[PDB]
């Protein structure tokens, strides 16, 4: 893939343009990439305790931590 | 009328129109009456559409008969006009017909086009 | 029980009206064609249309704007745009304690949030970042009107109470500058029974406005404020807290415990749940 | 200005618009009242320029350059009759107004229950009477949709759906602003209006194998079609007809 | 409003190139034909 204009040739553009207009949000991440969510967490917020245990405690999982674990 | 396999389905239509179009772009499709009568008689062609709004719809009319000896597939769209700027040649051609080679996925295309016109039928 | 109610005018007359009502319950009932319902002994069936979003009690419904869209904001701390012409609800979720009043501006163009923690916040429509903020001491309050949930005997009964001090302190190195412990707001930090202030506000003396937040003991404004079972959770609270002598340094404690309510299985010999 | 002949024109080339961009211009518009010519260019900038042949040290003098960050720009547009707004829009999924009028900058981002629907709002066109704005719904799927959006509040109001096979080329606000037409890809010209918010009438661009763009304009036009005169429809194939 | 006619060129020398010019139709009627063909009416 091949962009028309990279960020970085945007970047030099926007410094040499007059008023810049921030899009981003004053104090989240300016590559916007966010803290994203794992799994467990998405149930655990929602309210579905089961699954959420569930999925902490498989112990075959690569994932598997038990600091994870106590932290649930 | 006389046009009873017609195709009136839009999403048919619209397959047809692109297969057409692509297969002009394969130089492997006639355009016009005449030719598609020629192509049908040296038997090369495999798949012919026409056009049912035709003032005198009799100059097509002579079609069917020779493919249905012949044994291959016609069905009819609704609009001329539609399928010569299909074929991308500005004025509205009322029959294109377009034929087989060896080893194309046009030609897969193709098969199952008639495939859905004898659905059609 | 009608918790509250918002009325909405239909047009150099007044045609008709459609007026909705919000109740403790949880539930937000709409009415709609009021006028010629009631003008005609005998008159039609009436039904309210069933809005139903919060477990607790919607603090206040208003009709919107356009009267296309139903907003409403709860204890939940969640601010709902009802859609009302599809089925679907679309919505303003994490504020810092429950949405308490709410206005809609002149045109539809903006709205006053006064948030049950003694603060006001104006918002744009549909650009959700607050224009304005003003926020009071924040603190623990004998409130003149007694509630909006304590009308239906909850699980955990509010009581406008007061049980400790309110801890802070003032600043060396900044004397405009106090520290104050505080909770999610007012009414959900007093509720549960116990005091829940897990929260810092730094406030001024000299032009009585906020300043500054933040969190003191595990916080998660991110979640649910009630358990299932239908109680308001308790969140830890900072017994003492004092300043350093410089400015420099500030030592925070918190206590916590589970509830006697949930206990109820470790009781062994005469373990009981205080005990527990 | 005298009223023009039908088969020659007087055309006079002017002064270039100075500052050129760094990529191919995606979106055109003049300033509703004064000669003030916004140019908008997918390296993410906006020039407005105060349209002046006659100007010095440099004509047609750049008023100010204002860059939009991480996005491109690939449509810009005024809005109101009183040319109240500018509002702009690249591929990412938030847009922008500007409000001229105290210069702030909102960062419009939400749509109301249709925001998974919408993963891009590229494409949109605001109404001449200036109350609203109509994005169109990157969801193809055998019918395009298109949403209207208050700019009252920014708000969901409306979402007319059309059949076709890919969704919809282009759309106009009609003149009056009561309703939109909506030319879809293989050539449906639907007609829908707002003030039923129904859709009034459907028909065929003349077998026209895929509709790309359509525009709209004239005087005196039906007035229950909200009184715009020409239309125009232009193909994938390059034919363009006049209706 | 009106405004100036567009004909095909070719219309008009089809017009008199049809026939001869003795023994064409007389000047009223050609004129009759050639002014529908230039009339700006619908």
Known sequence: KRAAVSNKNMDLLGESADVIIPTADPGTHPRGRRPKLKPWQKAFRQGRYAAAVDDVLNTTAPSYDPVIALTL | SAAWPKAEDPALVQELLDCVQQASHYRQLKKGANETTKSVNRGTSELVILAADTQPLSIVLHIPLICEEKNVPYVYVPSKVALGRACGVSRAVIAVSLTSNEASDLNSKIRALRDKVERLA | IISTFDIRPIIAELQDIDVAVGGARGAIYVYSNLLAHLHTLRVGTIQPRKYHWHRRAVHSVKWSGDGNYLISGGYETVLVLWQLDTGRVDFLPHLSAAIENIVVSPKGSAYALHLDDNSAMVLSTAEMKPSMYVSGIQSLVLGDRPSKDALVRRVWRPIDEIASPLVATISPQNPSHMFLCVGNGQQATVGGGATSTPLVQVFDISSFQGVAKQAIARTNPTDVNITSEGVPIIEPTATKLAFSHDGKWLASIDEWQPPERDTEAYLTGSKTQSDA | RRKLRPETIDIQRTRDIPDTHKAAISSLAFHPRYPILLSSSTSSIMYLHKLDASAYPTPNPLLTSVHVKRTDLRRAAFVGPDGGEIIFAGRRRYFHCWNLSSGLVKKVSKIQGHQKEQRTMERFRVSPCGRYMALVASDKKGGGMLNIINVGTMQWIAQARIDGRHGVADFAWWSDGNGLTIAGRDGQVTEWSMITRRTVGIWRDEGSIGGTVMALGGRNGPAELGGDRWVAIGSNSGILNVY | ?42
């Open chain 5, 1 to 42: 409003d009106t405004h100036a006619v567009v004909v095909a060129p070719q219309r008009l020398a089809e017009i008199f190139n049809a026939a001869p010019a003795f023994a064409m139709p007389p000047i009223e009627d050609v004129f009759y034909q050639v002014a529908s063909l230039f009339s700006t009416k619908p």
